[PDB]
Enzyme design. Sequence first.
Site, short mmCIF file in Angstrom:
data_model
loop_
_atom_site.label_atom_id
_atom_site.label_comp_id
_atom_site.label_asym_id
_atom_site.label_seq_id
_atom_site.Cartn_x
_atom_site.Cartn_y
_atom_site.Cartn_z
CG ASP A 99 -43.45 -25.43 2.46
OD1 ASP A 99 -44.17 -24.73 1.72
OD2 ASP A 99 -43.31 -25.21 3.68
CD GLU A 100 -43.53 -21.65 -0.80
OE1 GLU A 100 -43.36 -22.50 0.10
OE2 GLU A 100 -43.96 -20.51 -0.56
CB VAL A 101 -39.41 -21.39 -1.16
CG1 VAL A 101 -40.08 -20.63 -0.01
CG2 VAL A 101 -37.99 -20.85 -1.40
CG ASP A 102 -34.50 -25.26 2.12
OD1 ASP A 102 -34.15 -24.33 2.87
OD2 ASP A 102 -33.97 -26.39 2.15
CG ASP A 103 -35.79 -17.81 2.38
OD1 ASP A 103 -34.99 -17.51 1.48
OD2 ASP A 103 -36.14 -16.99 3.27
N1 G4P Z 1 -42.57 -15.41 -2.94
C1 G4P Z 1 -41.55 -15.83 -2.19
N2 G4P Z 1 -41.77 -16.17 -0.92
C2 G4P Z 1 -40.64 -16.55 -0.28
C3 G4P Z 1 -39.36 -16.63 -0.78
N3 G4P Z 1 -38.48 -17.05 0.21
C4 G4P Z 1 -39.24 -17.22 1.27
N4 G4P Z 1 -40.56 -16.93 1.03
C5 G4P Z 1 -41.66 -17.03 1.99
O1 G4P Z 1 -41.12 -16.86 3.28
C6 G4P Z 1 -41.99 -17.51 4.23
C7 G4P Z 1 -41.19 -18.11 5.35
O2 G4P Z 1 -40.47 -19.25 4.82
P1 G4P Z 1 -39.48 -20.15 5.71
O3 G4P Z 1 -39.95 -20.31 7.11
O4 G4P Z 1 -38.10 -19.57 5.58
O5 G4P Z 1 -39.56 -21.52 4.92
P2 G4P Z 1 -38.66 -22.83 5.01
O6 G4P Z 1 -38.65 -23.37 6.35
O7 G4P Z 1 -39.40 -23.80 4.03
O8 G4P Z 1 -37.27 -22.48 4.43
C8 G4P Z 1 -42.83 -18.51 3.43
O9 G4P Z 1 -44.21 -18.12 3.50
P3 G4P Z 1 -45.15 -18.52 4.70
O10 G4P Z 1 -44.96 -17.59 5.86
O11 G4P Z 1 -44.83 -19.96 4.99
O12 G4P Z 1 -46.63 -18.43 4.11
P4 G4P Z 1 -47.43 -19.24 3.00
O13 G4P Z 1 -47.51 -18.32 1.81
O14 G4P Z 1 -46.67 -20.50 2.78
O15 G4P Z 1 -48.83 -19.48 3.61
C9 G4P Z 1 -42.31 -18.41 1.99
O16 G4P Z 1 -43.32 -18.53 1.00
C10 G4P Z 1 -39.14 -16.26 -2.15
O17 G4P Z 1 -38.07 -16.26 -2.76
N5 G4P Z 1 -40.31 -15.87 -2.77
MG MG Z 2 -45.40 -21.65 3.87
#
Ligand code: G4P
Ligand code: MG
Lengths: 176, 176
Positions: A99-103
């Site tokens: 995945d791209e980010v661990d938030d």
């Molecule tokens: N641009 C950006 N996005 C961030 C950042 N931090 C979190 N996000 C977005 O928040 C959404 C929820 O992430 P988490 O559920 O917290 O992810 P995690 O378990 O990997 O930590 C993710 O998109 P998603 O709901 O999974 O959608 P998708 O775009 O992956 O389809 C992620 O791309 C940041 O610093 N920058």
């Molecule tokens: Mg995602």
Amino acid sequence: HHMKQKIWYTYDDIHRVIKALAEKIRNAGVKYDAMIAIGGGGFIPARMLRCFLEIPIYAVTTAYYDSDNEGQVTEEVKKVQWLDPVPEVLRGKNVLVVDEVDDSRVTMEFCLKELLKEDFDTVGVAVLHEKIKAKAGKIPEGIPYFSGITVEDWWINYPWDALDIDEHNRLAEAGR
Amino acid sequence: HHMKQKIWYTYDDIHRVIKALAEKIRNAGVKYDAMIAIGGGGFIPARMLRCFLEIPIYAVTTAYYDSDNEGQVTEEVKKVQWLDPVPEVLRGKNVLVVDEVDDSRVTMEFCLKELLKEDFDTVGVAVLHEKIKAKAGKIPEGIPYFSGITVEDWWINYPWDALDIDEHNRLAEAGR
Ligand SMILES: Nc1nc2c(ncn2[C@@H]2O[C@H](COP(=O)(O)OP(=O)(O)O)[C@@H](OP(=O)(O)OP(=O)(O)O)[C@H]2O)c(=O)[nH]1
Ligand SMILES: [Mg+2]
Ligand SMILES: Nc1nc2c(ncn2[C@@H]2O[C@H](COP(=O)(O)OP(=O)(O)O)[C@@H](OP(=O)(O)OP(=O)(O)O)[C@H]2O)c(=O)[nH]1
Ligand SMILES: [Mg+2]
Ligand SMILES: [Mg+2]
Ligand SMILES: [Mg+2]
């Protein structure tokens, strides 16, 4: 709108981190047989990683949805696309979730818990960016974890969200 | 080893083409409801396209395998991962198949023929690069087709295959 510091990364910036991430994985001694990219955010990191790991990319996708439970509406993670069933060629194999980010780790925990129901040998996880912050989700026991770089709790602006890649690159250089 | 001319494209080069491709799609008047990316080559083009089209990316993956039929071994395309079943939210919707290169059209024909078995309204196809050359595969009738740019019959070197992105970028600039 966000209230924290912000950072912009070029495509090449991220490619260089992915190369280093592949080296971290290779040095841990487990040979992975396939990746499972979590779309949409994991697709570009996974295909960049394939340059260095040379294993096939399977895909799942999750999204947050408005969930109304017990008189309170909050966002919850759900499957959009899943590996149903897991193909037989992956039975007993080592799979690397990407995945791209661990938030918050809420998506990561959801996906890892679901994949531990399957007949894999080793399930590992690789993320491009690891934010240093409190985590609502937890990584299950015994899952190897790799991050490309650790980052402050800043909002990361990805090049694949740039309507204007020239302006995006300007902000990335203006942050170095 | 190849015997034709070669070209290298930066990540940003491709991002700019994807922006223009999204505009071509928008101008054709069909609003797509989701993408179906063909991995591994379609993953990065599809996520770049999501910046501009803002629709979810579903995924299939194909690969060539050594096929032994009638005393002759040739490579044939097969499914690695598929949309089984297609989710109900896509029934009667418009889906845009995404891939990186139109070279022989053998994969494209295979995937489009399979997806026409489903209950979609419009199936369209969008490719980053369309090579001008003879085609072994054929696009079914009634499928809208879009390419980002047309290219000579040259070998395209993608940045997501660059072990050394600096050398890759040098060769991309040395070709302009
Ligand atoms: N641009 C950006 N996005 C961030 C950042 N931090 C979190 N996000 C977005 O928040 C959404 C929820 O992430 P988490 O559920 O917290 O992810 P995690 O378990 O990997 O930590 C993710 O998109 P998603 O709901 O999974 O959608 P998708 O775009 O992956 O389809 C992620 O791309 C940041 O610093 N920058
Ligand atoms: Mg995602
Ligand atoms: N780098 C590069 N690759 C090219 C070029 N032309 C064709 N290919 C590769 O050839 C493979 C077979 O493509 P085709 O079956 O002809 O694709 P098509 O139907 O879309 O025209 C593809 O990889 P695949 O087997 O589908 O694998 P994957 O990498 O997509 O997983 C594609 O990436 C080129 O100029 N440069
Ligand atoms: Mg299942
Ligand atoms: Mg392909
Ligand atoms: Mg099916």
